[PDB]
């Protein structure tokens, strides 16, 4: 019966080959590059005792949550560098933080296997654990809010799950990966999401149904970060094989690879700009790179970190990009 | 310059900074450890005994606090993870040490233990992280060598030509064969450690029984050495 699977895989490969006529490079060749982009440090957010893994902006584009392995979530006022909140976590080994679109909640997860959801707006003045989501048999690598009541978690166990925050049960359990899922990016419309795992593969999922709608395989190693192009029909990845890749949901292929011979470290965070003309990637070579998505040339370098960039985030209106490194600092670049 | 409200906001930030400084003081004084070992490896006994004499169904990491000579130690053993390691091991690149507990009485799973040790030692993120390897279950190894039913040269052919090193220290007085066997195991692990050290981190062998009460002191002494080496590097002494 395995021969049937091999034949079907060959058929899918042939269909993808047939649907390919031109590459993004040829078609974009008649469009001018962004040129040299100089982005400067505007604010440095100090205060984390250990290294920073995760950082998620608020939809108000001013507030900002960050996670450190010292066991602390800090909410920042990016305009004034103030500390709005400091949430002591129950497990120090956090590797993901999320900020609710409404701004009422923040979530975190890590080696504890729980996604903890925090209530930022209470009658009392403190922030408290709204509830703890349990059920994963592996570390939670990413968590994203759909609304105040639904959250999507990705785990070291191949499962990505969908939870109802009211009474916390895995409403839909997404399975099909073979390795540890690392990144998780919701579509702008919150009906699909992409997962990048250690099987060097990415999958688009349908949240309402629970089925792997598409499966992308183009990488030579494990996949570390993922993000949607603002349009909702393309996404970009980062892998430890020192490359980024841009896949199109409708074309079901790879469009352009962002690589250079000099760089040999892995990408740890990928974030697009507001228009997608700039693709920002965080690396292990102490520095962050800014790429032109249409011409695949290094447009800029964001180099001010003394350790590896572990998180990277671009605000909803595109004014600033935040990057946090293993040196316990966030930098707000404009 | 800035309104009543911003001033108050700034005050809040300053109070938060004060609590964080306190957290920094507590964090710096506490040394973190990662406990690694197999299923047959007796790390469960070591963690239980250290919890006893010193100081939730799919939970992934277990926190074990203990204190030796007024020094605080946090020891973590991963509970609910899969076989794969190459991702969550990156989180432990700032620990004081990695305690690697091995079952020395297996003789058949011990090549797998060597492979795991060579995976830990050569990890790109675990460079500059020393390893306190606990060669656990010495009594079982002693009784197994004395009984003579199961051999050791059969699984490791080089055991025949191996001779007992002159720096051996079998203290209580034990048969020469058990000393030879345990130092052969130790020498295999130390060969892996020495092959590609480059001097940025060390491996500290210890022969352990899971019931022994001296394991905390062993960890304390090794951690003292590790911190001494780091501070030597930091204060421009080498």
């Amino acid at each position, epitope marked *: 019966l395995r021969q049937e699977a091999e034949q079907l895989k060959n058929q899918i490969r042939d269909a993808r080959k047939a649907c390919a006529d031109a590459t993004l490079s040829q078609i974009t060749n008649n469009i001018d590059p962004v040129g040299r982009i100089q982005m400067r440090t505007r604010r440095t957010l100090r205060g984390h005792l250990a290294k920073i893994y995760a950082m998620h902006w608020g939809t108000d584009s001013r507030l900002l949550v960050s996670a450190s392995q010292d066991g602390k979530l800090i909410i920042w006022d990016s305009y004034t560098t*103030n500390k709005v909140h400091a949430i002591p976590l129950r497990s120090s080994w956090v590797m993901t933080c999320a900020y609710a679109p409404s701004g009422n909640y923040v979530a975190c997860g890590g080696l504890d296997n729980i996604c903890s959801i925090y209530n930022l707006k209470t009658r*009392e*003045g403190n922030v408290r654990v709204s509830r703890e989501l349990a059920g994963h048999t592996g570390y939670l690598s990413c968590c994203r809010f759909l609304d105040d009541n639904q959250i999507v978690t990705s785990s070291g166990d191949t499962t990505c799950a969908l939870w109802d925050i009211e009474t916390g049960q895995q409403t839909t359990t997404f399975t099909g990966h073979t390795g540890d899922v690392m990144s998780l990016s919701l579509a702008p419309d919150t009906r699909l999401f992409v997962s990048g795992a250690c099987d060097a593969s990415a999958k688009l999922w349908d949240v309402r149904e629970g089925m792997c709608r598409q499966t992308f395989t183009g990488h030579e190693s494990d996949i570390n970060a993922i993000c949607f192009f603002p349009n909702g029909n393309a996404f970009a990845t980062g892998s430890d094989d020192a490359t980024c890749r841009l896949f199109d949901l409708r074309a079901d292929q790879e469009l352009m690879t962002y690589s250079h011979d000099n760089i040999i470290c892995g990408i740890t965070s990928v974030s697009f700009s507001k228009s997608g003309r700039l693709l920002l990637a965080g690396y292990d070579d102490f520095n962050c790179n800014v790429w032109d998505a249409l011409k695949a040339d290094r447009a800029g370098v964001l180099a001010g970190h003394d350790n590896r960039v572990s998180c990277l985030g671009v605000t909803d209106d595109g004014m600033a990009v935040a990057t946090g490194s293993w040196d316990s600092f966030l930098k707000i670049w404009n | 310059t800035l*309104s009543a409200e911003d001033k108050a906001a700034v005050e809040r930030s300053k109070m938060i900074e004060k609590q964080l400084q306190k957290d920094k003081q507590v964090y710096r004084a506490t040394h973190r450890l990662l406990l690694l070992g197999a299923d047959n490896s007796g790390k469960s006994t070591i963690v239980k005994q250290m919890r006893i004499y010193h100081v939730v169904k799919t939970s992934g990491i277990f926190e074990t606090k203990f204190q030796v000579d007024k020094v605080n130690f946090h020891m973590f053993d991963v509970g609910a993870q899969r076989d794969e390691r190459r991702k969550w091991i990156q989180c432990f690149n700032d620990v004081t040490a990695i305690i690697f507990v091995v079952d020395s009485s297996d003789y058949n799973r011990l090549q797998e233990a060597l492979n795991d040790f060579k995976s830990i030692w050569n990890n790109r993120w675990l460079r500059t992280i020393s390893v306190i390897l606990f060669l656990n279950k010495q009594d079982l190894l002693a009784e197994k060598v004395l009984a003579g039913k199961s051999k050791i040269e059969d699984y490791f052919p080089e055991f025949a030509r191996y001779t007992t090193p002159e720096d051996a220290t079998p203290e209580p007085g034990e048969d020469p064969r058990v000393t030879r066997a345990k130092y052969f195991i130790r020498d295999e692990f130390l060969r892996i450690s020495t092959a590609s050290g480059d001097g940025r981190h060390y491996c500290y062998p210890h022969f352990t029984c899971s019931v022994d009460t001296e394991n905390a002191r062993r960890i304390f002494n090794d951690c003292r050495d590790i911190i001494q080496r780091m501070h030597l590097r930091q204060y421009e002494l080498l």
Partner: single-chain antibody
Amino acid sequence: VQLVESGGGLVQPGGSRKLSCSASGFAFSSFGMHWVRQAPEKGLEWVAYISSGSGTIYYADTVKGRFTISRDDPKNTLFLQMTSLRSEDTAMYYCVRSIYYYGSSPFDFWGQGTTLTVSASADIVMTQATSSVPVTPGESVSISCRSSKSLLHSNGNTYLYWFLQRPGQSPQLLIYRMSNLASGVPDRFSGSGSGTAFTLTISRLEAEDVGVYYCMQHLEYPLTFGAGTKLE
């Protein structure tokens, strides 16, 4: 959350008293606290404010030296050391809770009040419109306020606050920073203005919407209030 305050009574002129405000149901240590008094038939006046961490203590000019404010965060009680009680010190003193960060809602909870009866310059003035607006239920009203100095700041925040006071219990917050409806306020209430002239609108009144409407500025100390507007 609740703020219960006590320690008041008939006091002879020139005497002293220590007003205490017991707080429970919220994280006291992270809140700043205000003392607001109102004369027996007049509007509200600010007495003092103590910050979280006690690093900022402000007093009104009228009580600049006689009064002293303190807090006991462990024991969770707010104190007011009053000395040399003159005859303008006959009022009901209110305990108010204020927290300050981006997006915060100051002056949200007001304590019940202590009654204290005594036997026989460059400050911002806030002026209400006629202190009587008789309106039938189901209509819409547009209570107005005027400020001497433009409450808008370079931040982009205009610091106008709207409070409602039933004929009975302590005031409750309705609008903070000029356009934001407090936790629990119905969507009928809406606030607007242009920096100096302000308006609060209630879209469709009810029988429970009656009381006296006070404004407040938080642009700079001291906190001045205004006379208040009565609805009947």
